[PDB]
Write a structure and sequence with these properties.
Chain B: It comes from Xenopus laevis. Chain B: Belongs to the NUP186/NUP192/NUP205 family. Chain B: It is found in: Nucleus. Chain B: This is MGC83295 protein. The structure is cut from a larger assembly and holds chains A (358 residues) and B (336 residues). With 358 residues, chain A is mostly helical. In chain A, 73% of the residues lie in helices and 0% in strands. Chain A contains 19 helices and no strands. Chain A starts with a helix and ends with a helix. Chain B is built from 17 helices and two strands. In chain B, strands 1-2 form a two-stranded antiparallel ribbon. In chain B, helix 3 packs parallel to helix 8 and helix 6 crosses helix 7. The chains are: A mainly alpha (358), B mainly alpha (336).
């Protein structure tokens, strides 16, 4: 009776640190009892995991904090749930370093997957609050997203799909390991088209910069995983937008290099797009556009040969000389226009510079 | 009921530490796959003993009164469902051992009962003289367990061909120990442990046996100092010490002297080698292909203040007690 009255008084007085200094064998049973019976279940679970962390019982601390993060409650925001999962991971890592139990490793992996799912949930919430603040259903949607951790399937069908959140849909299918190449291309198209629509009031340079920052930010996340970064589609689609808006032909080549797309892989894509002879370029009166982008890419390599690893540089320079020889033969088969003669001059100058690098 | 059996688990100073060491040896040195599951359980269970390192269980007025009444009421000992009546001689010896090492009276009784059980392996010694050997042997087993756990971590020098799961488990466990200030504890223990001071404590209470017992106690004490110095060395060979731990090691070596023949003793030679390995950069010469990833792993390139702090410490300061050792560290730093 006395210990219970003292603990309840210390809790009511907000003397939580002093309560946790009491090495009482009755404190844990009291906190566990109160966390089951009391309406303030959050507060007693908070004291219980801090007690376990202080006593170096990291396995029990991690389990209490994971249970706090999973608990349906309007008192625990999604941000606090992410803090709890992150604290559960830190405690679990401290336990697995001390414990060779396969079950502590499986639980750590479950928490790491759950943290990734919960970050996508937060990205959906922040996107809804930012872009849909005026929509009557968003207050209810945001409160539901705070009230519990959601499954990926529910996040996709109830929030990402109805609100057309193509960035969040891309993050969901990446996290789920679900690979549909058509869906991935459609989502990247919707992201590009939305960024181009949201920027319609801005200058041509500001629109180009907004799209560059968008594509670089997402490209740095997905470029390591080719199933979610459809490079050939992205290069083709962005080059079509450069032609549509009369932007700098360097734009796509610069953006892909800033994502860390390797110069040899980017050249392979442009070589394929050029050899595909898409009637779109002739219909747009821009038949030399892909060769202008190739010239900018290869001119950048000639200026800075360190963009290609030293071990492959010689092989890559030979591949560029062979490719330029092919492009020069195709340019000679086309009708002599002033623009074509300039492109031929540029490629001959580029050939003579690459021969000095071989 | 498990909680009342757990409270007596924390009182034993030898048997548990020898079990930890045998489990560590079997899993890491002998590579036994069956021992890996036992290693995870043992590391989780005895994590507080590794964090506290050589800390004795404290004295308690409740333990004192129980041990004093043990001749009439009996005491519950580990593994026995019945209370055992203790002889008045064993109760007096338990208070002497409790006073000598500042250990709880139940831990002194347990160490004497193990010393009585092991008295046939240690012929011509009394249970109390055997308890002194087992006390230092249990500390040696904990220091050797720490050494082998540090050797089996992921690093640059010791490649023990282990599964990536065992290496990851041991690396996480040993990282958690370093965050708890392991370097400062090791250097403090090496400074506090002295064979002469321990022999003077033992001599006051008549706890010094025959010529053999004096050697065995001296050898176990020196092994504890050596395995602790090797633990910091083996760490520095795997991963370079952080800024604060490197400055602690320098601040220890500042106070060190040479033997009467002009040589360094074993322990201080090992600690000088630990510092020289913290100053090693020649891994930057041995590979072109993994070079950027090895630069990202070295503590010297992670902390922009590391180089400035070590340079200022070696440039601006009082002569070390050994000027030649200071000159060795300055040469190693100049080459780095």
């Amino acid at each position: 009776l006395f210990n219970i009255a003292l603990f309840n008084w210390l809790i009511q007085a907000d003397l939580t640190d002093k309560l946790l200094e009491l090495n009482s064998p009755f404190l844990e049973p009291h906190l566990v009892r109160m966390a089951k019976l009391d309406q303030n279940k959050v507060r007693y679970m908070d004291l219980l995991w801090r007690y376990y962390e202080k006593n170096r019982n990291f396995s029990n601390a991690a389990r209490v904090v994971a249970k706090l993060a999973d608990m349906h409650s309007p008192e625990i925001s999604l941000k606090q749930r992410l803090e709890y999962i992150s604290r559960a991971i830190l405690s679990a890592k401290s336990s697995t370093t001390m414990s060779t139990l396969a079950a502590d490793g499986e639980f750590l992996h479950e928490l790491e997957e759950k943290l990734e799912v919960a970050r996508i949930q937060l990205q959906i919430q922040e996107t809804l609050t930012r872009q849909y603040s005026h929509h009557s259903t968003v207050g209810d949607a945001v409160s539901q997203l705070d009230s519990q951790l959601m499954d990926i399937t529910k996040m996709f069908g109830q929030y990402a799909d109805p609100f057309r959140l193509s960035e969040c849909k891309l993050a969901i299918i990446h996290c789920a390991g679900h690979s549909d190449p058509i869906l991935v291309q459609t989502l990247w198209q919707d992201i590009i088209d939305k960024e181009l629509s949201d920027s319609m009031g801005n200058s041509s340079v500001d629109r180009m910069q907004s799209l560059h920052l968008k594509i670089t930010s997402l490209g740095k996340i997905y470029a390591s995983t080719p199933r979610y970064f459809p490079l050939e589609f992205l290069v083709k689609y962005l080059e079509q937008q450069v032609c549509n808006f009369s932007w700098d032909a360097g734009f796509v080549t610069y953006t892909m290099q800033e994502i860390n797309v390797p110069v040899p892989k980017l050249l392979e894509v442009y070589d394929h797009l050029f050899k595909a002879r898409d009637p779109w370029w002739s219909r747009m009166k821009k038949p030399l556009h892909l060769l202008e982008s190739i010239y900018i890419l290869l001119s950048g390599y000639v200026q800075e040969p360190s963009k290609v690893p030293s071990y492959e540089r010689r092989r890559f320079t030979t591949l560029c000389l062979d490719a330029i020889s092919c492009y020069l033969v195709e340019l000679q088969s086309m009708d002599p226009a002033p623009a074509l003669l300039n492109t031929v001059s540029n490629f001959k100058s580029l050939q003579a510079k690459l021969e000095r690098l071989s | 009921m498990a909680a009342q059996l757990a409270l007596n688990s924390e009182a034993s100073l030898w048997g548990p530490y020898r079990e930890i060491w045998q489990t560590v040896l079997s899993a890491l040195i002998k590579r036994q796959p069956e021992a890996v599951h036992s290693l995870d359980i043992v590391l989780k269970k005895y994590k507080p003993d590794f964090i506290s390192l050589f800390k004795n269980p404290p004295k308690s007025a409740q333990q004192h009164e129980r041990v004093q009444k043990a001749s009439t009421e009996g005491i519950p000992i580990k593994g026995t469902q019945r209370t055992r009546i203790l002889e008045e001689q064993l109760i007096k010896e338990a208070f002497i051992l409790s006073d000598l090492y500042n250990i709880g009276e139940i831990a002194a009784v347990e160490l004497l009962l193990i010393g009585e059980q092991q008295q046939p392996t240690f012929h011509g010694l009394t249970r109390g003289l055997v308890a002194i050997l087992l006390y230092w042997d249990g500390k040696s087993c904990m220091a050797e367990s720490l050494l082998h756990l540090i050797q089996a971590r992921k690093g640059k020098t010791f490649t023990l061909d282990h599964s990536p799961e065992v290496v990851s488990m041991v690396t996480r466990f040993t990282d958690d120990l370093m965050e708890q200030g392991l370097t400062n504890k090791i250097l403090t223990l090496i400074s506090q442990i002295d064979v002469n001071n321990e022999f003077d404590k033992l001599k006051k209470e008549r706890g010094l046996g025959n010529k053999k017992h004096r050697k065995e106690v001296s050898d176990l004490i020196k092994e504890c100092q050596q395995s602790l110095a090797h633990s910091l060395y083996s760490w520095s060979c795997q991963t370079p010490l952080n800024r604060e731990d490197t400055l602690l090691l320098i601040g220890y070596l500042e106070k060190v002297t040479v033997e009467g023949d002009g040589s360094l003793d074993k322990v201080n030679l090992t600690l000088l080698m630990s510092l020289l390995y913290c100053l090693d950069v020649g891994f930057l010469e041995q590979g072109t292909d993994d070079r950027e990833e090895l630069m990202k792993q070295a503590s010297m390139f992670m902390d922009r203040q590391y180089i400035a702090a070590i340079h200022n410490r070696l440039q601006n300061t009082q002569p070390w007690k050994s000027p030649g050792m200071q000159a060795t560290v300055r040469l190693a730093w100049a080459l780095a």
